[PDB]
Design a protein around this ligand. Structure first.
Ligand SMILES: *[C@@H]1O[C@H](CO)[C@@H](O[C@@H]2O[C@H](CO)[C@@H](O)[C@H](O)[C@H]2NC(C)=O)[C@H](O)[C@H]1NC(C)=O
Ligand SMILES: *[C@@H]1O[C@H](CO)[C@@H](O[C@@H]2O[C@H](CO)[C@@H](O)[C@H](O)[C@H]2NC(C)=O)[C@H](O)[C@H]1NC(C)=O
Ligand SMILES: [Ca+2]
Ligand SMILES: [Ca+2]
Ligand SMILES: [Cl-]
Ligand code: NI
Ligand code: NI
Lengths: 191, 386, 191, 377
């Protein structure tokens, strides 16, 4: 057994989320500096707050040290295994790993674009969305009515219209396990 | 005084949404701002109701606004943005009876709805809910209902929401006023603890306009009573004053642990079956009745009795039922109106938790024609343990 | 009958402070709109929020109606006498007044300036600060050495230096009832 | 077993700054930030101690920092900024025994200090408390003391502060860690309720070294005892092991002024009622007078003994003597009438000068310098 008394939790959530990890420990006599490790490597430029509290009358008595790492905007590069590191004399202790994963609503890579057409004439609209998590099921709408019964059925990435005879609109919903994001509303102008 | 007592404990720091059967909002806020302003609304929420309106925000009936609602136990967002209706429904289950944080914001060129700080809907929108008028920016907000008629939503819904709300934060205001007036008005507070059911506190009843026409009358009552007497389910001919069918609790028996209760299946004034039952032990029970010309059976926790009528009597009652049912009839739940005690054995109000399926269809008190105000539609308080 | 249940409080404070005033009331029937008055004039451009709570199931039953005025950044043009106003029929009702006034640490109109001078040359520095609260006592410092026993009972407003030989520095403290504010430190470079 | 119970019930969500007589900070925070970052610190605070150190924020000893402190019951801010020090005091009286909000923040090119969200000090400053080093910005922050020696403050101060902190916000952090470790360390929680005075739980003593020089020994003790016997005040000679003078309680319930084992006066008190009694003494060759609540007690000596007991006392005062409060070291029980530790609330003036337990040569940790708990009804 080691000097760590609690281990970094996890933080999993969407891009831009701010969260913290913290490990705390107990040492004897003036405390060591606690470093953080992304994937077993020192983090050199990271928002952290160490908190030291002595338990005896003196600075020579036991101490409760505790570092908190701050991620302000959870971008994808922040992903992976985190753990604390303390050098105690001529010996190296490390905490249990915490994980930061990143997951959230779908994200559109393609959305239906406005178009103008003579119609009744064929045309196609696109709609692509990604996670994580996967898969992401698509659902089309024409004049804000769904066309199909649940995400996943029926038309998905490409929507073919035999052709309309009157200006209409078309939205796209993207569902995954976290929830739904809805696309711009394309307007298809007809002459 | 009741054989089983239920908890009366309320939560001073809470807002009850289902206070008014009319569907009127339990709070109406009105904001005027100098700078342009994005809507933000956070609050904690807890319900079993699978359908109703959480809040409305925006402006005139047909103009530009959002309504955050429940339907099939999941969040539903409706929008009008210049005459373009639109509705989105998604996210996890809400009506699980457990507190959770819901939030709505105008973040960017989107609406973002979160459950427990984790986004469940991003709806793309171009436009602001706050509307300029007279050098200022206006927005109206209303909780637990809309300011306009429910027919003029994008999607009709039954706004009536038996749900509880706490730790609210409307546009980061510091107006302890709702909080204050809730303290002084216990009608506006919810049960500290809730459990699945519908509580009949026994001061009123509810009724429906149900058809039974060949004909069935099937009823399954899941009950956990407080009192030993009262009407579970009944039919009313408004014109004749009559009570074509009733299912009720009564008692008088004769040992220490005063048993003592019976369930009574009954046409008008004469019983058809009688079955002993132990309602006053805090356990749930299933009374269940199945009629149709020729047949009439009363089960209690999966147990039939055999009738109180010869079979000749049975037909000369079911023909009287058949008759009543050809005309329109009201389906009562939890009591009858004031009537002669000669027209039906029990006329009393029911006290306690009860659920009712009628003809294989589950009754929803929010859907009732009338529903007395103290009857909570989708939550029961728990049993007091002394 | 006067419908007001509680009248406006006060906000006495310093510039930049943000505060509210609220007044609530109870009325039979649909609740009226409530107007805020400063010094007898209805404020046509103010942050306000009206809360309305119905008390019966009926909307023709009673209502509790609050209003809170928000002052996002307190300043002198806000200083004055506030009260709520409502119309019930062709009869009007005014709340009892509440009061907002500014009060805090001294504000600097003029602080000692950097200068450059030859040795043994006479020159003058200035330091002007105002309340409220009045009076405002000043106290000069040269190289962080107070030039007097205590604030006010020293040299004030204008300081006359007979001349220097080394480079020196000068500050000036403004003290009033609420506390102290200290000027920028002025350097006087000598040649 | 106490005759008067004192309501020693602590407060779990609080932080006692006076814990360590060493002056070691009760908390030390080390900040490392990626963006340039500006100091904000808010907390609620309550005390009767008129002198002490609330917090320190900055870097190296002679680099650039601030210290928020109490002197003569008022706030004082010391800054060093690039080796130039300045001290500033203003604002209302703080040590009135009532909770207030306090806050330090960097605002524009100024430092702003507020009591109850209302500003009492606005100090002009050139530059920032956070500082660059290896591509990050760094700041240290300590509570209840500084991380260097009181010598090297802009103006020296006795940092020991019998005060109570709660609802703290250090840089808008959310690190429930101080709060947790206070929960499991009752030595770090302060009395839920405080009253004026200094409390002795009977577990130890404090001592000073005071000159009594011709000579005199005036001692006034504002006592509210929790126990019928105990040493309030005493002198003591390290070499000869003697107790040249002592003032104690004993039972069935009376005060005693003594030299060595012989008592020079006696005077009764009903000490277990819970009222403030004023025990007062005066000594000087020829004279020895013990009063209590204004009333004098008659002596246990002729006058021929009194002169040849005062003769011994003055021989002891030409040697060095430790003045003790609230107890005595282990001594032969034949060396003084009472030797057990005092329990209760007490305030000592010696020679028309008030004793500050923070100014002692030694103080047992459980003695609280400027607060007593209330008596329990
Ligand atoms: C906000 O709601 C208020 C009601 O609280 C609206 O006031 C009504 O508006 C109609 C026009 O739409 C007026 O003719 C009525 O006189 C008002 N009724 C009452 C009872 O005051 C108000 O228009 C709404 N404002 C916005 C921007 O939506
Ligand atoms: C903040 O305080 C810490 C100690 O808690 C300082 O760390 C010491 O700094 C000196 C000088 O760099 C080193 O030689 C010591 O070995 C350090 N000790 C530890 C445990 O790290 C730190 O320098 C201070 N920093 C600031 C900006 O005040
Ligand atoms: Ca409902
Ligand atoms: Ca002190
Ligand atoms: Cl909870
Ligand atoms: Ni499917
Ligand atoms: Ni003066």
């Amino acid at each position: 057994e080691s000097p760590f008394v609690s281990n970094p939790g996890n933080i999993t959530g969407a891009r831009g989320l701010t969260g913290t990890l913290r490990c705390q420990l107990q040492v004897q006599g003036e405390p060591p500096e606690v470093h953080w490790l992304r994937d077993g490597q020192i983090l050199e430029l990271a928002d952290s707050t160490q908190t030291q509290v002595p338990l005896g009358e003196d600075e020579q008595g036991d101490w409760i040290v505790a570092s908190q790492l701050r991620i302000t905007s959870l971008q994808l590069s922040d992903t992976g295994q985190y753990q604390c590191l303390v050098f105690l004399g001529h010996q190296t202790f490390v905490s249990q790993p915490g994980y930061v994963r990143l997951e959230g609503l779908p994200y559109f890579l393609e959305e239906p674009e406005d178009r103008t057409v003579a119609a009744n004439t064929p045309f196609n609209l696109s709609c692509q969305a990604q996670g994580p998590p996967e898969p992401v099921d698509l659902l089309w709408l024409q004049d804000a009515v769904p066309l199909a019964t649940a995400p996943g059925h029926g038309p998905q990435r490409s929507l073919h219209v035999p052709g309309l005879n009157k200006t209409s609109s078309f939205s796209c919903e993207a569902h995954n396990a976290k929830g739904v994001t809805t696309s711009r509303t394309a307007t298809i102008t007809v002459l | 005084l009741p054989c089983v007592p239920f908890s009366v404990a309320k939560s001073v720091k809470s807002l009850y949404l289902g206070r008014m059967f009319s569907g009127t909002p339990v709070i109406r806020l009105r904001f005027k701002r100098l700078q342009p302003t994005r809507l933000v609304a956070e609050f904690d929420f807890r319900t079993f109701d699978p359908e109703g309106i959480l809040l409305f925000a925006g402006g005139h009936q047909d103009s530009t606004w959002i309504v955050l609602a429940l339907r099939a136990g999941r969040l539903e967002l409706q929008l009008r943005y210049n005459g373009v209706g639109r509705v989105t429904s998604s996210g996890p289950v809400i009506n699980h009876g457990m507190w959770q944080t819901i939030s709505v914001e105008e973040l960017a060129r989107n609406l973002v709805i979160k459950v427990n700080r984790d986004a469940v809907m991003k709806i793309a929108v171009a436009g602001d809910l706050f509307q300029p008028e007279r050098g200022l920016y206006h927005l109206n907000l209303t909780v637990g209902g809309i300011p306009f008629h429910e027919k003029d939503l994008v999607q009709p819904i039954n706004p009536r929401l038996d749900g509880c709300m706490r730790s609210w934060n409307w546009l980061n205001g510091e107006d302890t006023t709702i909080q204050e007036t809730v303290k002084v008005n216990t009608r506006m507070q919810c049960f500290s603890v809730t459990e699945r059911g519908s509580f009949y506190p026994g001061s009123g009843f509810a009724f429906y306009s149900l058809d039974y026409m060949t004909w069935e009358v099937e009823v399954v009552a899941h009950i956990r009573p407080a009192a030993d007497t009262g009407v579970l389910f009944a039919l009313w001919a408004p014109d004749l004053r009559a009570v074509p069918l009733s299912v009720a609790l009564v008692d008088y028996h004769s040992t220490k642990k005063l048993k003592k209760q019976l369930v009574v299946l009954a046409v008008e004034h004469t019983a058809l079956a009688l079955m002993e039952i132990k309602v006053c032990d805090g356990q749930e029970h299933v009374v269940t009745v199945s009629l149709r010309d020729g047949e009439a059976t009363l089960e209690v926790d999966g147990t039939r009795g055999q009738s109180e009528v010869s079979a000749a009597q049975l037909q000369e009652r079911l023909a009287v039922l058949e008759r009543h049912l050809r005309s329109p009839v009201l389906t009562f739940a939890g009591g009858l109106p004031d009537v002669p005690v000669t027209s039906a054995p029990v006329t009393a109000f029911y006290r306690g938790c009860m659920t009712l399926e009628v003809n294989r269809r589950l009754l929803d008190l929010d859907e009732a024609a009338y529903k007395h105000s103290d009857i909570t539609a989708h939550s029961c308080p728990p049993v007091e343990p002394a």
